[PDB]
Structure formats: C-alpha cells, structure tokens
Amino acid sequence: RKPKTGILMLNMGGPETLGDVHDFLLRLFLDRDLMTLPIQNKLAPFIAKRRTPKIQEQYRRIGGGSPIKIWTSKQGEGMVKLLDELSPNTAPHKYYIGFRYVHPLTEEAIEEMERDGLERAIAFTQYPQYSCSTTGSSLNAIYRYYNQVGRKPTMKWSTIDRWPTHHLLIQCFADHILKELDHFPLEKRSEVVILFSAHSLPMSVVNRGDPYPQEVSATVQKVMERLEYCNPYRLVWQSKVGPMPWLGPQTDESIKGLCERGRKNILLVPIAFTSDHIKTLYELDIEYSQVLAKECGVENIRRAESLNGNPLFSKALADLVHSHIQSNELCSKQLTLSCPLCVNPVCRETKSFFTSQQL
Ligand SMILES: C=CC1=C(C)c2cc3[nH]c(cc4nc(cc5[nH]c(cc1n2)c(C)c5C=C)C(C)=C4CCC(=O)O)c(CCC(=O)O)c3C
Ligand code: FES
C-alpha cells in the first residue's frame, strides 16, 4: 500500500563516525542561518580543520560517533505505528529523516519524498523550542530546495514548527526527573538543585528577537508545575562555541558556582534535546559530571535520561501530528511573524512557502 502521508523529522544530525566529523563541521560553520561569521565562506573551512581533532576525540570517548540517527529512527518508527492507528484516513504514514548537516540531508529526504508520490508532507521539527538557528534553518532548507530547482512541490506541505509545551513532552521530562531524584541519597533529595540545561545561543541571535529563550523558559515552567516545585531550579545554557558573547549563565560555571556555594547535589536536565548525543554523553556526562564534578568536590550530580526510546515521547510525536492534521493549519501562528530585527531575506519566502499551500 503506497505511502500517503510523509513526516519529515528535522534536526541537526551528527557525525556517525570520526571520519564524518570534518565535513559535518564544515557544513555547520558555513550555515549563515545557524550563526553569522565574517568571511564565513573562508573562515568555516579554517574552523572545521582546527576543531576536527578534539571533536573526533570527544566522539571516540562516547563510542565512536553520534547515535542521533538511531534514536531519531526509533522515535519515527514508533510514531508511524501510532499514526497508522490514530489517523486511518491519512492512509499509511512514513517518516523521513532530514538532518541539516549530515546524510540524510534535508534535500535528499525531500527528493525521496517526492519520489514516493506522497500526497501530504509535514515538516516536523525535532527542536521543541523554536530558534531561527535551528528549526528556522531547517525550514529555510526546504524552501531553498524547491526554489533552486525552480519547481513546485508535487505534494501538499504544512509544518509543525514548534511544540515547547506539549503535555506529553512535559510529562516525559517530569517522569525522567522524578526517577533521578529517587537516586540521590535520601537525606539529600530535598536539597538537590535542578539545573535545566538548554543549548545556548549567541547574543547576536538572541538580540534580534529569537523566540528560543522564551519557549525554553516555557518548557521549564510547565515541567516545574508538574513537579509542583518539589525542588529549587535554574535555567542555564550549555555548549557555547567561540569567543563572542552568548546567553548565560553557562551550565559549567553554574555547576562550579553552585558547588563552591554549598549546593553539592545537582540534577541536570537536557531540556532542549530529544535524544543523547555529544551534548549530553560527552559534555554533561563526562566533561561536567566526571571532570568538573570531581575537581569542585560535588557529592552527587546526576542527569535525567534523554527522551530517547521512551514510549510516551513517541506518543507525543504521533499526537502532535494527528492534532496537526485534524486542525488543517499550515503552521503555528508564531511562524507567520518573523524576527522584528530579521535581516535574512529567505525567512520571508520560507514563511510564505507554508502559508501558501492549498488544502
Ligand atoms: C546557533 C549556535 C550554534 C552553534 C554555533 C552550534 C554548533 C554546534 N552544534 C553541534 C552539534 C549539535 N548541535 C545540536 C543542537 C543544537 N545546536 C544549537 C545551536 C548551535 N550549535 C541548538 C540551539 C541546538 C538545539 C537546542 C545537535 C543535535 C548537535 C548534534 C551532535 C551529535 O552528537 O549528534 C556542533 C558540533 C560539536 C562541537 O562541539 O564541535 C557544533 C560545533
Ligand atoms: S532570523 Fe528570525 S525570522 Fe528571520
């Protein structure tokens, strides 16, 4: 039975092997939509070459590469199973992986979708909170794909561009957070500080009106309401790259800072991610939870498990898609509004790309 509804899952993607690091980094630092750099066409290759060695080592420390592909697949397949049941009219569904900087690229996925003769195409972002740097860049890629070849899509497009407070997403983090608290020494539980660690963004992106920080902050609130404020918490930011200013406080300074101030029991939460990858398995689990923790003398620092294979997360993706279809909306209302200080000509086009679809 021919596939009827295609769900394109969008994310950054990561290198599968050490041999894939360099090209991954080149594509990444060349992407003006992610972040701007002077003479980016020439600076990117320089950055890529210089950075490749230490990143390769980091990947070797966590198994030899990023597992983002396998988790995205496990989540997609689970979503499809529930969709075929939840929405019979939308015939069989099929998910497509659209990574921004590694195979399968966003462009390759779209081609396969067109090749499949689908009727419906849904750009489903895997970034729950929207940033023009993440979901925005991935969507711009879909627009430019058709714009370059200069042909109209052979399928109906629509997009779920964000879902920062979806109740099942909130329940997963809350569930994962409770299971972690249960593992601190009992007499230290009520003292544990919950640090929600979202990926940071350069202030050059934040100060243009990026929706990201506010949406992340929204995810944090919901989760803490569900936990009914059982513990104190803070929203900190990880993974800053380069010397320019980024949104702080940084997760590392925060962990170090709490530890030197009497708060030696910390629970980390990768609130802006959907699966394990370098940002969690290496940065949070090794760099901070092993090295930094040991040097500052932390008594207990743990991290809530990533959404990964949680059945409930799969239920969340399917429910979002089903509701999306039932609604007939082409995109969120927020997508119809670009950054007040947006200076990217493509944004206007991408926006129109989804708001233009008939049916
Ligand atoms: C806009 C500024 C950003 C820059 C400059 C950025 C840079 C990177 N992001 C990477 C990987 C990644 N970044 C990722 C999600 C995000 N990355 C984000 C924003 C940025 N990410 C945001 C926001 C994300 C979602 C909350 C993911 C998913 C990986 C994949 C790595 C892996 O192991 O799969 C890597 C490769 C790792 C390294 O340390 O060399 C870089 C350099
Ligand atoms: S950079 Fe945000 S809408 Fe263009």
CATH of the domain at 60: 3.40.50.1400
The tokens for 351 are 């926006």
The answer to whether 323 and 152 have CB atoms below 8 angstroms apart is: no
To one decimal, the resolution in angstroms is 2.2
SS3 content of the chain, % helix, strand, coil (to 5): 50, 15, 35
Q: Ligand 1 pocket check: which of 279, 281, 308, 339 to mutate, most ligand atoms within 8 Å of Cβ?
A: 279
Residues 254 and 326 in one domain: no
What is the C-alpha separation between 109 and 99, in angstroms, rounded?
Answer: 9
| Sign of the dihedral through C-alpha 261, 266, 268, 269 | negative
User: Measuring CA to CA, which residue among 177, 271, 183 is closest to residue 231?
Assistant: 177
Chain centre distance of CA 109? 18
Residues 312 and 273 in one domain: no
The answer to whether 262 and 191 have CB atoms below 8 angstroms apart is: no
Between the CA atoms of 320, 321, 322 and 324, what dihedral angle is there, to the nearest 10 degrees?
A: 80
Residues pairing with 95 in the sheet: 7
CA-nearest residue for atom 1, ligand 2, is 342
Residues 14 and 67 in one domain: yes
CA-nearest residue for atom 23, ligand 1, is 199
Specify the experimental method. X-ray
Q: In sequence order, which residues have a C-beta less than 8 Å from that of residue 22 and are 6 or more positions away?
A: 48, 49, 52
Residues 168 and 158 in one domain: no
Query: Which residue spans within the chain are E strands per DSSP?
Result: 5-11, 93-99, 120-125, 156-160, 193-199, 233-238, 265-269, 300-303
Pocket of ligand 1 contains residue 10 by CB under 6 Å: no
Which amino acid, 84? D
Residues 144 and 256 in one domain: no
What is the C-alpha separation between 224 and 324, in angstroms, rounded?
Answer: 26
User: Measuring CA to CA, which residue among 133, 138, 76, 2 is closest to residue 320?
Assistant: 76
**What is the number of the ligand closest to the CA of 140?**
2
Sheet containing strand 233-238, edge to edge, reads 233-238, 193-199, 265-269, 300-303
Residues 120 and 230 in one domain: no
- Integer CA distances (angstroms), 125 to 12, 19, 263, in order: 10, 27, 36
DSSP state of 34: T
Instruction: Write the DSSP string, 4-19.
Output: -EEEEEEE----SSGG
User: Can you say which residues are annotated as belonging to the binding site?
Assistant: 51, 59, 66, 132, 339, 342, 347
Residues 156 and 196 in one domain: no
The tokens for 340 are 């007040």
CA-nearest residue for atom 3, ligand 2, is 338
H or E element, residue 171: helix 167-181
Helix 21-30 vs helix 40-61: angle between axes, to the nearest 10 degrees? 140
| Sign of the dihedral through C-alpha 247, 199, 126, 10 | positive
Provide the domain limits for residue 181. 164-306
Residues 14 and 100 in one domain: yes
What is the C-alpha separation between 63 and 303, in angstroms, rounded?
Answer: 19
Give the residue numbers marked as catalytic. 166, 319
Residues 55 and 88 in one domain: yes
What is the C-alpha separation between 134 and 140, in angstroms, rounded?
Answer: 10
Which amino acid, 166? H
Which amino acid, 3? P
Residues 10 and 157 in one domain: yes
Residues 260 and 129 in one domain: no
When divided into structural domains, the chain yields a total of 2
Residues 80 and 211 in one domain: no
